Amino acid sequence: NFNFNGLTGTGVLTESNKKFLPFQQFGRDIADTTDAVRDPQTLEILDIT
Amino acid sequence: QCVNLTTRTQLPPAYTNSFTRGVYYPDKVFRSSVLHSTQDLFLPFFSNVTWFHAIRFDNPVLPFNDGVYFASTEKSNIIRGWIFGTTLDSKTQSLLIVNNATNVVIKVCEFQFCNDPFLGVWMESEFRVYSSANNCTFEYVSQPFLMKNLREFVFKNIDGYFKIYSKHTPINLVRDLPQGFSALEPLVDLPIGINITRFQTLLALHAAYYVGYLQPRTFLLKYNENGTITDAVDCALD
Ligand SMILES: *[C@@H]1O[C@H](CO)[C@@H](O)[C@H](O)[C@H]1NC(C)=O
Numbered sequence A: 001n002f003n004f005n006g007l008t009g010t011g012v013l014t015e016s017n018k019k020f021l022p023f024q025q026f027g028r029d030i031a032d033t034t035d036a037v038r039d040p041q042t043l044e045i046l047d048i049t
Numbered sequence B: 001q002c003v004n005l006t007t008r009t010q011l012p013p014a015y016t017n018s019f020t021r022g023v024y025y026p027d028k029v030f031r032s033s034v035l036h037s038t039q040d041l042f043l044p045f046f047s048n049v050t051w052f053h054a055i056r057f058d059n060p061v062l063p064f065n066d067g068v069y070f071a072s073t074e075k076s077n078i079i080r081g082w083i084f085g086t087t088l089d090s091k092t093q094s095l096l097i098v099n100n101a102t103n104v105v106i107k108v109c110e111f112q113f114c115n116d117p118f119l120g121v122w123m124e125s126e127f128r129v130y131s132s133a134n135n136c137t138f139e140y141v142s143q144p145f146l147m148k149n150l151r152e153f154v155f156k157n158i159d160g161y162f163k164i165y166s167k168h169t170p171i172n173l174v175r176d177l178p179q180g181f182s183a184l185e186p187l188v189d190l191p192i193g194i195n196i197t198r199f200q201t202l203l204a205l206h207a208a209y210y211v212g213y214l215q216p217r218t219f220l221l222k223y224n225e226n227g228t229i230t231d232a233v234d235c236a237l238d
Helices: none
Strands: A002-004 A006-011 A013-015 A026-028 A034-038 A045-048 B022-024 B028-031 B033-044 B048-052 B067-073 B080-087 B094-100 B104-114 B130-142 B149-158 B161-170 B184-189 B198-204 B209-213 B215-223 B229-234
Touching: A002 A034, A006 A034, A006 B215, A045 B184, A045 B209, B022 B033, B022 B149, B022 B229, B033 B149, B080 B149
Parallel strands: A026 B028, B022 B184
Antiparallel strands: A002 A006, A013 A045, A026 A034, A034 A045, B033 B215, B048 B209, B067 B149, B067 B209, B080 B094, B080 B198, B094 B104, B104 B130, B149 B161, B161 B184, B215 B229
16 A cells, blocks of 8 residues: 555555656656656655556 | 835836736646646736836836736846735735745745835845835745746736746747747745735836736646647637
8 A cells, every 4th residue: 555645555565666757746647547656765766657 | 024116117017018928837747748637826928018128117016817927038137026815915924935045935925015115135134125024924935947038927916826837948039928838837826815906016126027827727748658748728818
């Protein structure tokens, strides 16, 4: 389960290969479902499968 | 410590200014190759953006219609700030936003502002802007936005929350805002807790600036393959 500084849901965690611009903390796919997230404290991108 | 110039330059509060594709990122969400429809306050494209001459300092208190955009083009960073609130005459609180000591400093309080406020310049001083303040609500400090370079900002106040987004590029044309796509990055987010219906500009004295207004319209933001915005449409402008 997740609660990343308010972002919640469920999934399997693996490292992401999606880069975020300084403007964004979280990303979404086609149909707007959250996939990749930036860790609230660590500047790395994590994928929620 | 005010200079007592009270220049009171008298020019109409209007200007033809070509302006297009000036948006801010509405969220912190990254989308690849997605056209995003967002309903928020943005400056309508080709809307009235008033250009004010300055030191003879043209700086009337102007209406804040939902929110505003500001921009200026000066190498020395002579314009140092903005003042926002219902009256700006010490009867209500206002938001004093300044740029000095290579940082951005914001204070929300009831300030005894001078009719033609200047930052002192050496030692710098805020007392040439206002003599005192009381009944204070909030303070905020952030990184400088400095880099003739153009500094474009959007100022919003939603239910007591104040936001600034900005973009900085070199500019050759200073008679009009530059054209082309520009998306602004968030700089501040404050619980100021006040009514902004009016605003005024703060200038350092040894200066001209643009100001527009926002409307609650749908914008189509065209996102690129890696989440940046490359274009924009102002819904029902024409
Ligand atoms: C702004 O309004 C004034 C009215 O005095 C007009 O002359 C000017 O063309 C307008 N500018 C734009 C960009 O609409």
